[PDB]
Design a protein around this ligand. Sequence first.
Ligand SMILES: [Ca+2]
Ligand SMILES: [Ca+2]
Ligand SMILES: [Ca+2]
Ligand SMILES: [Ca+2]
Lengths: 84, 269, 269, 269, 269
Amino acid sequence: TGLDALISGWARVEQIKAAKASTGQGRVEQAMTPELDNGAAVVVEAPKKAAQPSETLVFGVPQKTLLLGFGGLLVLGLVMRGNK
Amino acid sequence: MRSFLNLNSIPNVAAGNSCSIKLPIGQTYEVIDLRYSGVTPSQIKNVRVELDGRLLSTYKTLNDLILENTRHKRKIKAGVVSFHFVRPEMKGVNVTDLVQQRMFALGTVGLTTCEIKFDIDEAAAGPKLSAIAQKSVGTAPSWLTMRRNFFKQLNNGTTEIADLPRPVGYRIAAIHIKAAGVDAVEFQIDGTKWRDLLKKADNDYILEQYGKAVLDNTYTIDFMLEGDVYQSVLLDQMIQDLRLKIDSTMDEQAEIIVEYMGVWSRNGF
Amino acid sequence: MRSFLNLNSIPNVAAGNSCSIKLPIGQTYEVIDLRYSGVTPSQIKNVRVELDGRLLSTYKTLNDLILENTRHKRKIKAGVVSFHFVRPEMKGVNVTDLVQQRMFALGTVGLTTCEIKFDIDEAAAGPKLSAIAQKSVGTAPSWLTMRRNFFKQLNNGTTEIADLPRPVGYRIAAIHIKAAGVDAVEFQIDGTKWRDLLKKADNDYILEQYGKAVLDNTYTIDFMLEGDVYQSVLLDQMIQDLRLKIDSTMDEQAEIIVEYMGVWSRNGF
Amino acid sequence: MRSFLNLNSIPNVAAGNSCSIKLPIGQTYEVIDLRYSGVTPSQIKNVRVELDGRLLSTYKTLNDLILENTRHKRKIKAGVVSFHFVRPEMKGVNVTDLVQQRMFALGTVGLTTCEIKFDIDEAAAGPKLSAIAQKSVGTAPSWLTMRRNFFKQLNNGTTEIADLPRPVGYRIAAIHIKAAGVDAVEFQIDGTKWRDLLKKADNDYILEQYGKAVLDNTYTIDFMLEGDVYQSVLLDQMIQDLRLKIDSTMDEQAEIIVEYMGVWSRNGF
Amino acid sequence: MRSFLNLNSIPNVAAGNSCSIKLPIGQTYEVIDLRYSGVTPSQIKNVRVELDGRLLSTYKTLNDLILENTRHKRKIKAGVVSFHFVRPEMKGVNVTDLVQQRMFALGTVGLTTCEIKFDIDEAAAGPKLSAIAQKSVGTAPSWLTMRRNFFKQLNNGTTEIADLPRPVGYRIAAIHIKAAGVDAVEFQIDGTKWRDLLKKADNDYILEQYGKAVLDNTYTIDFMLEGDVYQSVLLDQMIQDLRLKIDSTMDEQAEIIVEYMGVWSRNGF
Ligand SMILES: [Ca+2]
Ligand SMILES: [Ca+2]
Ligand SMILES: [Ca+2]
Ligand SMILES: [Ca+2]
C-alpha cells in the first residue's frame, strides 16, 4: 500500500466523474439512482494466485506424451534406414 | 450536475429526545445544511456521524461544528449549520483543486447505513430541525475527515500529551487544544521539533496569515495551512513518538480535537 | 483410582518470608488445595508456578487465584484456595468431557523440578500454610494453562493494546482487563472483528449466560464460554495483528491477564 | 472461534409500531440477545421467527420467551431476553453434548431472508430495543426448534385434544398446557399410554427432578427431560392417534404450546 | 421415548405393617418416585431392593435414601423420595455421559421378581404411600449399585476396619462412615495409601469441590468424585488388604455404608 498512490487514485476518481459531468449522457446515467435503506452487501476475503501444483502435473503428462512421440518418430526413422 | 434535496422530516424532534438524520444510501453527500430553531447549537449535544454503525466524526455540541466552519472562514448564518464533507479550502498539488476538495465528500456506495445522531437538550425551548442535502453522483465513502474527541488535564506549567491515537496509514490535518490558559505549544515526532515552542500570538498570526479565523480559548495546530493534504501528519507505523508540549497558565481540563484523515474502512479507525 | 495426599510441611512459613511448595516428581497433579490462616490471600504475593525453573503461571497475589475460581463458579471456601490444573468446565468435541478436562492436569514426568513459589507479606499476622494434593497416574507436563501478567496504561477515551505476546502454536483461553473505568472493548485479529465494541453490560450478560461470575473492576473476554477448547484463539504463526480496543472513562494502569494454553516445552513460552 | 456482533439498529422502534429484526444471511446464529427498555416483555406482541417468509417459531408475547428460558433454568436478566437457538440442555447419545446442542443453531446458508418480526404495544412507555448476535460458521437452517401456538377450550371435567398437527418426520420436544385449572394429564399414541394420568404435583416433581423450573398455570409434558433428542415424540407417518387427556377443574381457554423439531424445509412444516 | 406410569396401589399400607412394592417384569426402571404422607421417612424401616428374592440394596430407613440423594445434590421434595437407579452424576470416558448414567438403570429382563420391601413403623400417624415409575426399554439387570449396611464399633483414638466384603470383579463407588466423632480417616489397599489421613474439614472440602453435599455425622470417601466409574475401587482378587483407619474422638458404634457396583448375577454378591 502507498498513501500517495492511493490519493492519486482518489484524484483520478474525480476526473472520471468530471467526464460524466461534461456530457448530457452522464447526467442521465445518474437519474436512476434512488435513496432507500435497503442494501445487498457482500464483504468477504478472496484468494489470489496459484503456482507449482498445476505446473508439476501439467509438466508430467505432456513430457510423457512427447516421449511417446519421439519413440514413434525414432522407429519410423530407424525403419527407413532398414529400407536403404 | 448536482442535486439539492429537502431531506425527509426528522423523526421525533422534541426536548430531551434522541434524534437521528438517517441518510439514504446510493449517492454522495457533499454538504448537509441543518436548519434549527427553538434550540441553541449548544443544546444539540453528542453529535455523531456514523457509517454502518461505526463512528466517523463526533461533536460534543452542534456549536463545535459552527466553530469548525468559522475557523475556515466559511459562510456562517444564524439558524443554520452545515456539515461540510467536501473541504472547500483544499488545493491540488498533482490534481485540480476541485478534485482535492470533492475527495472529502461523503460517498455512501457500499454502505448499509449513514446516520447523523444527536441528543436534544431538555431545556430546549421548542426544537425545530430540518435538513437539506447537496448531493452528487455516488462514490464509496473513501477519503473522509474523522473528527475525534479527547479530554486531558492541564497543569499550570508544562503538560505533555503523547498518548494520541496513531491509526496506521491515517493522517492528521489539525489539532485543536480547547483551553483558556494555553500560552505556547510545541509539536514533535520522534524527537524532531516540527513546531517549535510557538507563543499563542505567533501561532495565531500564522493561522490568520492563511485566511483562518482564530477560535476563542483554542490553540490550533493546522497542518494543512496551504490546503495541501500532503503537508498533514502521516501516521507512519515506524513512528515511535507523537508528542505535544503545552505551556499553560491554568490548571484545567482541555478538550483536544484531532482531525484525522484516511480511507474509510469497515474495520478501520 | 486417584490418590489424596497431605503434602510435606511447607518450610519456613513466616511473615516477610519467601516460601515454596516443592512438588515431588513422578505423578500427575490434578488439584492442589492450599489451606491458609493468619494471613490474607492478598498477603500471599508473587505466586509463581515453575516447571524446571521456568515460569508457567503467575499471580500477583493469592487473591487472583480465588477470583479465577470464582469466575468459573467453582467451590470457594474461606481458609482454602485450590489450584485447578484440571479444568472442570471443559467439554469434549471429538473426545469425552473428562478427557478434555483432565488434559490440563499438571503431569510431572520428565521434570526435574516442580515448584509453587510465593512471598509472605510482612504484615501477615501469623501465617500458617499447608497443602493437599489430588494426584493421578504420571504424565508429561503436556497441555497446561499458562497465566501471564501484563501492565498497560488506559486512557480516558480509547486505548489500543496490540503488543500481547503471540507464542506460535499456543492458544488464548481468555483475557481479563483489570480496570475500574472500562466501558466497552473490541477484539480483532487481522482486521477481523471477532468481538464487536461490546458494552460492559452486554459482555457481562453473555458471561453470566454461560454460568460464569462477573469479577469486580474486570472486563473478561472469554474465548471458551462453551467449554470448547477449539473456540479459543489459536495463535497462528500467520496472524499479522492481534488488537484490543478499550474504551475507558478513567486514566489508569490496567493489569491485563492473559490465559495462554499449549504443550509445555522445556524451551518454550 | 465465535463472533459477537452488535446487530444493526432496529428500524422504527416506537409504540404501536410493527418492527422487525432482519438478520444478515451467511453465518450461523447460536444466540440472539435482545435488550429492551421503556416497554414490557408482554408489550412486545406477536413475535415471529421467519425463514424465507415462512413461520418457524411464534410467541404471543416476548414474555413467553422469558418463560421458555426460565423453564430450562437459563440465565435470566431484567432488561434482556435471549433467543436460544442452540439448546444448552442437550446431551449426546452417540455424539458429544456440544454437537447435540449446536445442532439446533440457526444456520442461514441458502436462505433468502431471516427475520424476527414483532409488534410494539400502543401503551409502550418509550420503547428502546437493540440486539446482539452470537454467531458461528455458516450452516444450512437444518435441524431447528419450531414453537407452535394452539388455542383450545378446556372443560371442568375431562377434555381430549387429538387434533394436534403431526408433520411427518418431525418430532415433539414438549407440550405446554397453559391453563389455571389443570389437575392431571394423560398422553397416548395409538392407544399406548406413554404418560399415565399424572397429577400436576407428580408431573411437576419429575420436571424439577431434571433441573427444570415449573411455570405458573402450566402443565408441561417434557419429552426431553434427559436432554436426549431421541426421547422426543417421533411423528411417524403411520401414527393413527396422538391424544391428550386433560383433567381440569375450570372452564377456560387454554393456550397449548407445542415445541416441534425437524430439518427445516422451504416447503415443509 | 420413556414411559411414566402410576404404579399399582401398594397393598396393606398401615402402621406396623410390612409392605412391598412389587415391580412388573419386562422393562427398565430408571427412577421410582415414592410419595409418602402420614408417616416419616425414618418410620419406613428396613428398605430392601430385591431381585429374584436376593438382596440388592438396603436402607435402615427411608431417610437414608433421602440423604443419599441430598449428597449428590439431587432434587429433594418433602412428601416424596425417589429411587435413582440411573446415576445422573455419571460422566463417560469412552462413552457418552448418558450411556454411563443409564447403565445403572434397573433392567428387569430375565427376572422372576423385582421388589422393594419395607416395614411401616407402629407409631406411623396415618401412612399413605404411592409410587410412580419412570421406565424405558427392557434390559437385563446388568450393572447395578448395591448399597450394603455394616455396623462396627469405634473407639476413642484409632479404629481399623479391614473386614469389608471384597466380592471379586465388583467395585466400590464410595464408603460412608456414620459417626459423630470422626476426626480423620485413612484408606489403603495392600499398604498403598490411596487416601492419606485426611482431616474431616479437608475431606469435606474436596467433596464440596465436586458438587457434593456433606452429610451430618458422616465421613464420605467418594471414589467417583469426577463421575468416572473407572476411578472407583476395583475389588481385584489379588488384593490382600482393604483397610480403613478411623481417628475418632468418641466411643460409639458406626454404621458403615458401602456402595458396591457390578454386573448383577443370579448367584453373585
Ligand atoms: Ca470521500
Ligand atoms: Ca497436562
Ligand atoms: Ca440447525
Ligand atoms: Ca443396569
